Design a binder for this molecule. Structure first.
Ligand SMILES: *[C@@H]1O[C@H](CO)[C@@H](O[C@@H]2O[C@H](CO)[C@@H](O[C@@H]3O[C@H](CO)[C@@H](O)[C@H](O)[C@@H]3O)[C@H](O)[C@H]2NC(C)=O)[C@H](O)[C@H]1NC(C)=O
Ligand SMILES: *[C@@H]1O[C@H](CO)[C@@H](O[C@@H]2O[C@H](CO)[C@@H](O[C@@H]3O[C@H](CO)[C@@H](O)[C@H](O)[C@@H]3O)[C@H](O)[C@H]2NC(C)=O)[C@H](O)[C@H]1NC(C)=O
Ligand SMILES: *[C@@H]1O[C@H](CO)[C@@H](O[C@@H]2O[C@H](CO)[C@@H](O[C@@H]3O[C@H](CO)[C@@H](O)[C@H](O)[C@@H]3O)[C@H](O)[C@H]2NC(C)=O)[C@H](O)[C@H]1NC(C)=O
Ligand SMILES: *[C@@H]1O[C@H](CO[C@@H]2O[C@@H](C)[C@@H](O)[C@@H](O)[C@@H]2O)[C@@H](O[C@@H]2O[C@H](CO)[C@@H](O)[C@H](O)[C@H]2NC(C)=O)[C@H](O)[C@H]1NC(C)=O
Ligand SMILES: *[C@@H]1O[C@H](CO[C@@H]2O[C@@H](C)[C@@H](O)[C@@H](O)[C@@H]2O)[C@@H](O[C@@H]2O[C@H](CO)[C@@H](O)[C@H](O)[C@H]2NC(C)=O)[C@H](O)[C@H]1NC(C)=O
Ligand SMILES: *[C@@H]1O[C@H](CO)[C@@H](O[C@@H]2O[C@H](CO)[C@@H](O)[C@H](O)[C@H]2NC(C)=O)[C@H](O)[C@H]1NC(C)=O
Ligand SMILES: *[C@@H]1O[C@H](CO)[C@@H](O[C@@H]2O[C@H](CO)[C@@H](O)[C@H](O)[C@H]2NC(C)=O)[C@H](O)[C@H]1NC(C)=O
Ligand SMILES: *[C@@H]1O[C@H](CO)[C@@H](O[C@@H]2O[C@H](CO)[C@@H](O)[C@H](O)[C@H]2NC(C)=O)[C@H](O)[C@H]1NC(C)=O
Ligand code: NAG
Ligand code: NAG
Ligand code: NAG
Ligand code: NAG
Ligand code: NAG
Ligand code: NAG
Ligand code: NAG
Lengths: 227, 237, 365, 99, 49
C-alpha cells in the first residue's frame, strides 16, 4: 500500500524509479526534435532552402553553397545516429540485466546476496509493466531483531570421537541446531553430525551417556546390547 | 597528492590575483564540482567492509579472531576433516607473504597490481584531458575573422558580423556537443563498472561466492578485502 | 520575464521545469552605462592609455577587445607587458609606466540555481553576497539561500551535496545499511529473527522506439539536383541508415525472444483466479472482461501499471503513436509528426505495446 | 626485444566424474589478485551561454535562435551527474559497529 | 569433497537407497559393510545376539 501511495527516497525506491521513467519517455522526443531543428540552420550558406540557393545563384557557386548544407546536415545526422547508438548500447545492457533479473529473481529464488533488490534475504519478486520496460518489486526479508547465542564448534564424546556439523550454513548453539540466516531452532539429529578424525580444544567435552541428551535421536548401539 | 587540492571558486571571483588554470577555465563557464564521495568516506566504506567480515554478531562483543572467519569460510566450500594448527599457519604464512608482495609491487598482466596501476593512472588523467580539450577550442576561429566575438563586432557591420559570429557559435556549440558525447560514454562505462562493483562486494566481500571464477579469476575464493582508490575501489581477492 | 524564476523558465523555453540544477548568469549591472577603457603601448613620445578600475568596462587592451573588470593585483611579473593563458585568453596586463599589473576578470560569473518545488530555493555561486537570507561557505563555493539550517532530507542530490525543499543545503549522510552476520565457528553469534518483508523497486528499460531516417530526403529535401552532389559522399548516407536499422532489428529480435508468455500462468493471473490469502495483490493484478471492442477479451492494466503509465506518459496512452496514413493526405495543416515525416523521419511503433508487456508481467506473477 | 605473448597455462580444474582415476587438489596456498573498479566521475557543469557567447549580450540573442541545443547540453550533463550522485550515495552503506 | 582433500570415514547418512544396482558399483556383503561404513547398524545381528 505504501508503494501505491508513493506513486501518487533515493536509489532502489519509488522516487528514483519514477525519475528514470520520466527520462525514458522524454529522451526519445528530445533527440528527434533536435534533429529536425537542424534543418532550420543555414550552415554559413545563403539560406536553409536548397531550392532557394539554386534559384538565387549560378550553378557553379550554388554547388559550393549547397555543400555547406550537405556537410552541415549530414554531420547533424551523424550526431543523432551516434546518440542513438549510445542509448541502444545502454538499453542492451539494461535488458540483459532484466533478463537475468527475471530468470533469477522472479522465476526462481536467488542465492546471490544483494542481487535481487539490494541487501536482505530475497524471498520473491514480482513484475509490473512500465513505459518501455519492467518495474521490478523485489520483496526482501529484513530482520527486526537478533538472538544472541553461543555457537559450538562441535562435539568431542569420550575424548575419542570428534563429531561436528556437516552443513556449513547450520549452527549448533545453546543445545539447538538452526540456520545461520534465520532463527529456526531445532533439536539436533544424528544425521546432522558427521565424524571427524581429530578433535580440537574448542569442542564441547562430552561422555557417551550424556550424548543422547544432546542428540535424542542417537542410538547407543552397545548400551542397547547390554540389556 | 591529496584530494583536498580540488580547487575552490570562492577565491575565483576575487580578481585581486592573476587567474590560474582553474579560474581561467571558470571564466569560460566551466565549473568542476567536487567528486561525489571524498577519500575519507570511501576509506570508511572500505574499512567498514573489512571490519564486517569479522563481526560475528549484532553487537561489538561478538568480535572474532580473523582465523575463525577464515576457518568458517573454508568449511563453506569443503568441511575441514583435519583441522591441525599447522594446516592453518601455512595459509597464514602464504597470505602474509603475498600481501607484502603486493605492497612491494605498489612501491605483470591482467588481474595483477601493474594492470591496476595503469587503470588508476588513466582514470586520474582522463578527466583533465577532456576539460583541457574543451577549453582550447575557444582559441580557434572557426573560419571567422577572429576568435573573439567582441573583436568581430568592432571590425564589421552588424549584418555581416552576425554571419561571422555564427560560424564560431556553430563551431563552439559543436565542440561543446563533442565534450558531452564523450562524457556520456565515460558515464556509461562507469555505470557498468559501478554495477559490477556493487555486485562484486555483495557476492565476494560480504559473502563467499559459489560462482567459479567470479572473484579474481580461477581457483576457490575464500574472501576479498577492499581498499579505497582514486575515484573507485581496489578489490583484493 | 520579470521574476528570476521566470527568467530561468524562459531561458529553458518551458512553462514547467523538472527539479534539478540549472545554469544561471550572475546579475550584472542593470544600468549598463559601461565606461570605455583603452590601453596600448606608447608611440612616436606619447601615451594615450586610459582605464577605469573595478567597474564593468568595455575595454581594448593591446588589441584584446572585450567587456570585463580591471583590478589592480599584487603580482610583480617581470617579463612582457600583457599576459595570456595557454589558450590565448587575456588574463593580465602591465601598466608599462609604473610596472603594476592589472588582472582582467569577467563582469558576470556562472551560477547554478537549485530549482526544486517550482522555485529557486538556492544559488551555488562564487560571489559571497546575493539577494537571500544567508550564505553558507562550502569548501568550494558559496551557497545562498533562505534557509541556513542543516539539510537532513535531501530532495535533490548533486555531487557532494544535497538540498532540501526548504532551501537548506547539507552533506548526504552516510546511510547505515543492513547489517550482515559474518559466519564463524565458535563464540557469541547473533541469529536474525522477527523478519519483516520490504519491497524495493527497480525500473529496467527494455527497448527504444525504432526510427528510420531517409537520409536522401532529410539532406536533399527531395531536390533531384542535390541528390547528385550527395552521391559524391559515397556511403555516408548508406552507413547512417544501416546503423539505425541494425540497432532496431537486434533489439527487436532480442525482446521478442525474451518475452515468452504462458497461457496457464495467464489464467492464474486474474483477480478471480489468484488467491493471495493474506497477501493483497489487488494493486498488482489487472482486471479482464469481455470487450465489446471486436469481441476479444481485454485485460486492463493493474492499478500500479495505470498509475505508472497515465501520470508519466505525456500523451496519456501508448496508443497515441501517430499513423502516417493520414500524413500523405495533405488536406489538413500538418502537425508535428507530419512535419517531421515530410523531412524523412519515420518513428515506427515500439517492438511491444503495453498490452503484451502487461500480459508478460501477469504471466510471471 | 619483441616476442609473441605465450599462451599462459591456466589453473587445472577437475571435471567431476563417477568412477575411475580422479585427482583431488590438496595443500592449497592463497594468492591475492587485485582488481580496480571505478565508481564515479567528477561532475562538470558547463554554462553553455557564457561558454559560447563569452558573456556578450548581442551574441546571446543569436544563440537563442538555436533553441534547445544549448539547453540539451546542460540538461544531459547535470542529469548524468545526479544519477551518479544518487547511485554511489546509496551504494556506500556504512555500519559503525563494523567500523 | 571434490574441491579439497579432506578424507573422512563414511557415514550412514552420506548414503541413500537406489532401486537398481549397476555394474560399476563395488560388490559387497553385509559382513563387509560395517567395515566400509563403521556407522552402519546391523539390525539383524544386533537383535539375534
Ligand atoms: C599607468 O601608470 C602611469 C604612471 O603611474 C599613470 O600615469 C599617472 O597618471 C596620474 C593621473 O593621470 C598622474 O597624476 C598626476 O598628478 C599631478 C599632481 O596632482 C597632476 O599635476 C598631473 O596632471 C597628474 O594628474 C601621474 O603623474 C601619472 N604618472 C606618470 C605620468 O608617471 C597612468 O595613468 C597609468 N595608466 C595608463 C597609462 O593607462
Ligand atoms: C559474549 O561474550 C562475552 C565475553 O566474551 C560474555 O560476557 C561475559 O558474560 C558473563 C555472564 O553474563 C559475565 O559474568 C558476570 O557478569 C555479570 C554482569 O552481567 C556480573 O555479575 C559479573 O561481572 C560476572 O563476571 C562476564 O563478566 C562477561 N564478560 C565481559 C562482559 O567481558 C557474554 O556473556 C557473551 N554473550 C552471552 C549472550 O553470553
Ligand atoms: C589409474 O588408471 C590406470 C589405467 O586407467 C590404472 O592402471 C595402472 O596404470 C599404471 C600406469 O601404467 C600402472 O603402473 C605401471 O604399469 C606398467 C604396465 O606395464 C608397469 O611398468 C608397472 O606395473 C607399473 O606399476 C599400474 O600397474 C596400473 N594398475 C592396474 C591395476 O592396471 C591404475 O590402477 C589407476 N590408478 C592409479 C592410482 O594409477
Ligand atoms: C575439553 O577437553 C580438552 C582436552 O584436553 C584434555 O582433557 C581435559 C579434560 C584436560 O584434562 C586437559 O588437561 C587435557 O589435555 C581441553 O583442552 C585443554 O584445555 C586446557 C585449558 O587450560 C589446556 O591447558 C590444555 O592444554 C588443553 N588440552 C589439549 C589442548 O590437549 C579443554 O579445556 C576441555 N574443555 C573445553 C570446554 O573444551
Ligand atoms: C558385481 O556384481 C555384478 C552383478 O552380476 C552378478 O554378481 C556378480 C558378483 C556375479 O555373481 C555375476 O555372476 C552376477 O550376475 C557383476 O556384473 C557381472 O559382470 C560380468 C563381467 O562382464 C558379466 O559377465 C555379468 O553378466 C554381470 N552380471 C550382471 C550384469 O548381472 C560384476 O562383475 C560384479 N563385480 C564388479 C567389480 O562389478
Ligand atoms: C529570510 O527569508 C526567509 C524567506 O521568506 C524568511 O523566512 C520566512 O519568511 C516568511 C515570509 O518571507 C515569513 O512569513 C516567515 O515568518 C519566515 N520564517 C519562517 C518561515 O520560519 C526569513 O524571515 C528571512 N530572514 C531571516 C531568516 O533572518
Ligand atoms: C550543520 O552541519 C555542519 C557540518 O557537520 C555542522 O558543523 C559542525 O557540526 C558538528 C556536529 O557534531 C559540531 O560539533 C561542530 O561544532 C560544527 N562546526 C561548525 C563550524 O558549525 C553544523 O553544526 C550543523 N548545524 C548548523 C546549524 O550549521
Ligand atoms: C486490498 O487493496 C484494495 C485496493 O483495491 C483495498 O480496497 C480498497 O480499500 C480502500 C481503503 O482505503 C477503499 O477506500 C476502497 O473502496 C477499496 N476498494 C477499491 C479501491 O476497489 C482493500 O481494502 C485491500 N485489502 C483487502 C482486500 O483485504
Ligand atoms: C561399545 O560397543 C563396542 C562394540 O561392541 C564394545 O567393544 C564396547 O565395549 C562398548 N562400550 C562399552 C562401554 O561397553
Ligand atoms: C614474493 O613472492 C615470491 C614467490 O611468489 C616469494 O618467494 C617471496 O618470498 C615473496 N616476497 C616476500 C617478501 O615474501
Ligand atoms: C598583496 O600581495 C600578497 C602576495 O604577494 C598577498 O599575500 C597580499 O594579501 C596582498 N594584499 C595586501 C598585502 O594587502
Ligand atoms: C523479536 O525477537 C525477540 C527475541 O529476542 C523476542 O523476544 C521478541 O518477542 C520478538 N518480537 C516480536 C515477536 O514482536
Ligand atoms: C471540410 O468541410 C466540408 C464541409 O462541407 C466537408 O465536406 C469536407 O469533408 C471537409 N474536409 C476535411 C478535410 O475535413
Ligand atoms: C602437500 O601435499 C602433497 C600431496 O598430499 C605432498 O606431495 C606435498 O609434499 C605437500 N606439501 C608440503 C608438505 O609442503
Ligand atoms: C533380516 O531381518 C528381516 C526382519 O527381521 C528379515 O525379513 C530378513 O529376512 C533378515 N535377513 C537375514 C539375512 O536374516
Amino acid at each position: 500500500g505504501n508503494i501505491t501511495s508513493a506513486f501518487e527516497r533515493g536509489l532502489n525506491t519509488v522516487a528514483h524509479a519514477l525519475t528514470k521513467v520520466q527520462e525514458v519517455v522524454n529522451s526519445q522526443g528530445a533527440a528527434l526534435t533536435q534533429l529536425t531543428v537542424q534543418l532550420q540552420h543555414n550552415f554559413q550558406a545563403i539560406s536553409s532552402s536548397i531550392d532557394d540557393i539554386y534559384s538565387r545563384l549560378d550553378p557553379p557557386s550554388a554547388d559550393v553553397q549547397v555543400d555547406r548544407l550537405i556537410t552541415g546536415r549530414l554531420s547533424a545526422l551523424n550526431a543523432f545516429v551516434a546518440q542513438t547508438l549510445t542509448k541502444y548500447t545502454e538499453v542492451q545492457a539494461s535488458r540483459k540485466l532484466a533478463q537475468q533479473k527475471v530468470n533469477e529473481c522472479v522465476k526462481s529464488q536467488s542465492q546471490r546476496y544483494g542481487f535481487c533488490g539490494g541487501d536482505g534475504e530475497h524471498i520473491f519478486s514480482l513484475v509490473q509493466a512500465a513505459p518501455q520496460g519492467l518495474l521490478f518489486l523485489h520483496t526482501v526479508l529484513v530482520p527486526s531483531d537478533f538472538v544472541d547465542v553461543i555457537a559450538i564448534a562441535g562435539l568431542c564424546v569420550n575424548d575419542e570421537i570428534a563429531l561436528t556439523l556437516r552443513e556449513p550454513g547450520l549452527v549448533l548453539f545453546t543445545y539447538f541446531v538452526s540456520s545461520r540466516r534465520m532463527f529456526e531452532p531445532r533439536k539436533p539429529t544424528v544425521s546432522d553430525f558427521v565424524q571427524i578424525e581429530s578433535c580440537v580444544v574448542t569442542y564441547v567435552n562430552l561422555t557417551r551417556d550424556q550424548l543422547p541428551d544432546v542428540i535424542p535421536d542417537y542410538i547407543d548401539v552397545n548400551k542397547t546390547r547390554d540389556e | 597528492g591529496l584530494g583536498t587540492v580540488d580547487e575552490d571558486y570562492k577565491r575565483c571571483s576575487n580578481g585581486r590575483s592573476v587567474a590560474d588554470l582553474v579560474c581561467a577555465q571558470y571564466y569560460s563557464g566551466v565549473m568542476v564540482l567536487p567528486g561525489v564521495v571524498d577519500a575519507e568516506k570511501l576509506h570508511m566504506y572500505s574499512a567498514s567492509l573489512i571490519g564486517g567480515m569479522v563481526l560475528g554478531g549484532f553487537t561489538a562483543a561478538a568480535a572474532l579472531p580473523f582465523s575463525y572467519a577464515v576457518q568458517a569460510r573454508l568449511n563453506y566450500l569443503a568441511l575441514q576433516t583435519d583441522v591441525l594448527q599447522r594446516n592453518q599457519q601455512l595459509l597464514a604464512e602464504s597470505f602474509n607473504s603475498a600481501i607484502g608482495n603486493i605492497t612491494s609491487a605498489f612501491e605483470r598482466g591482467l588481474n595483477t597490481v601493474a594492470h591496476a596501476l595503469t587503470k588508476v593512472q588513466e582514470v586520474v588523467n582522463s578527466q583533465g584531458a577532456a576539460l583541457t580539450q574543451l577549453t582550447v577550442q575557444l582559441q580557434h576561429n572557426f573560419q571567422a575573422i577572429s576568435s573573439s566575438i567582441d573583436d568581430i563586432y568592432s571590425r564589421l557591420d552588424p549584418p555581416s558580423a552576425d554571419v561571422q559570429v555564427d560560424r564560431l557559435i556553430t563551431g563552439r556549440l559543436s565542440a561543446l556537443n563533442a565534450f558531452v558525447a564523450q562524457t556520456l560514454t565515460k558515464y556509461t562505462e562507469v555505470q557498468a563498472s559501478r554495477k559490477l562493483a556493487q555486485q562484486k562486494v555483495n557476492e565476494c566481500v560480504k559473502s563467499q561466492s559459489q560462482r567459479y571464477g567470479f572473484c579474481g579469476g580461477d581457483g576457490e575464493h575464500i574472501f576479498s578485502l577492499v581498499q579505497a582508490a582514486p575515484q573507485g575501489l581496489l578489490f583484493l581477492h | 520575464c520579470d521574476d528570476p524564476v521566470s527568467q530561468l523558465k524562459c531561458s529553458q523555453v518551458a512553462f514547467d521545469l523538472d527539479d534539478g540544477f540549472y545554469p544561471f548568469s550572475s546579475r550584472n549591472l542593470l544600468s549598463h552605462e559601461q565606461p570605455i577603457s583603452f590601453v596600448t603601448l606608447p608611440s612616436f613620445v606619447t601615451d594615450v592609455s586610459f582605464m577605469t578600475l573595478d567597474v564593468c568596462t568595455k575595454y581594448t587592451i593591446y588589441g584584446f577587445k572585450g567587456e570585463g573588470i580591471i583590478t589592480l593585483t599584487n603580482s610583480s611579473f617581470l617579463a612582457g607587458v600583457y599576459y595570456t593563458s595557454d589558450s590565448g585568453q587575456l588574463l593580465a596586463f602591465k601598466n608599462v609606466t609604473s610596472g603594476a599589473v592589472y588582472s582582467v576578470t569577467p563582469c558576470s560569473f556562472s551560477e547554478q540555481a537549485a530549482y526544486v518545488d517550482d522555485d529557486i530555493v538556492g544559488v551555488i555561486s562564487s560571489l559571497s553576497s546575493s539577494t537571500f537570507n544567508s550564505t553558507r561557505e562550502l569548501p568550494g563555493f558559496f551557497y545562498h539561500s533562505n534557509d541556513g539550517s542543516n539539510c537532513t532530507e535531501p530532495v535533490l542530490v548533486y555531487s557532494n551535496i544535497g538540498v532540501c525543499k526548504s532551501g537548506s543545503i547539507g552533506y548526504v549522510p552516510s546511510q547505515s545499511g543492513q547489517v550482515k552476520i559474518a559466519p564463524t565457528v565458535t563464540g557469541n553469534i547473533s541469529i536474525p529473527t522477527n523478519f519483516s518483508m520490504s519491497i524495493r523497486t527497480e525500473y529496467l528499460q527494455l527497448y527504444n522506439t525504432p526510427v528510420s531516417v531517409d537520409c536522401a530526403t532529410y539532406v536533399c529535401n527531395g531536390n533531384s539536383r542535390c541528390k547528385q552532389l550527395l552521391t559524391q559522399y559515397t556511403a555516408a548516407c548508406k552507413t547512417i541508415e544501416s546503423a539505425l536499422q541494425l540497432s532496431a532489428r537486434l533489439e527487436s529480435v532480442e525482446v521478442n525472444s525474451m518475452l515468452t508468455i504462458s497461457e496457464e500462468a495467464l489464467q492464474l493471473a486474474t483477480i478471480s483466479s489468484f488467491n493471495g490469502d493474506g497477501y493483497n495483490f489487488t494493486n498488482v493484478l489487472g482486471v479482464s472482461v469481455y470487450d465489446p471492442a471486436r469481441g476479444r477479451v481485454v485485460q486492463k492494466r493493474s492499478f500500479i501499471e495505470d498509475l505508472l503509465f497515465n501520470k508519466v506518459v505525456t500523451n496519456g496512452l501508448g496508443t497515441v503513436d501517430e499513423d502516417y496514413k493520414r500524413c500523405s493526405n495533405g488536406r489538413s495543416v500538418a502537425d508535428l509528426v507530419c512535419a517531421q515525416y515530410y523531412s524523412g523521419v519515420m518513428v515506427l511503433p515500439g517492438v511491444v505495446d503495453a498490452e503484451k508487456l502487461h500480459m508478460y508481467s501477469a504471466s510471471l506473477i
